[PDB]
Amino acid sequence: GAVKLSISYRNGTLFIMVMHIKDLVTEDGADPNPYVKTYLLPDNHKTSKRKTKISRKTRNPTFNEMLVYSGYSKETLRQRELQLSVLSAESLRENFFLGGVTLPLKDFNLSKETVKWYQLTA
Numbered sequence: 001g002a003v004k005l006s007i008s009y010r011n012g013t014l015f016i017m018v019m020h021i022k023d024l025v026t027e028d029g030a031d032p033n034p035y036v037k038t039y040l041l042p043d044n045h046k047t048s049k050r051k052t053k054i055s056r057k058t059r060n061p062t063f064n065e066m067l068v069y070s071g072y073s074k075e076t077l078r079q080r081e082l083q084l085s086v087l088s089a090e091s092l093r094e095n096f097f098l099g100g101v102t103l104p105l106k107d108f109n110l111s112k113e114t115v116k117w118y119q120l121t122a
Helices: none
Strands: 002-010 013-022 034-041 062-070 081-088 096-104 114-119
Touching: 002 081, 013 034, 034 062, 096 114
Parallel strands: none
Antiparallel strands: 002 013, 002 114, 013 062, 034 081, 081 096
16 A cells, blocks of 8 residues: 655644555455554653544545644654554454554655655555
């Protein structure tokens, strides 16, 4: 799969727009209920979990949801990685992992908005 993200930083705040995802795969032949969960790692204070809403019965969800990280300096973010996970929300069994990508923030020009597709790995 692949996820389209817009990443920007303004007024002390990191903005991660989760736009959409294509080509999720499951090993059960059923369409998943994807949501996106992010952390900013390391997270010693345990405050960085963010999640989108659930998109139902689709391998190609559109979210157009913004995840917000307040209170981080650009300096601090250079030593953080955005850990993005896509999971399927399940009511009768455990939520399970569909794919993910980890993005070191030092690779980003945080003075601009970076919009691109990222390949998901399992």
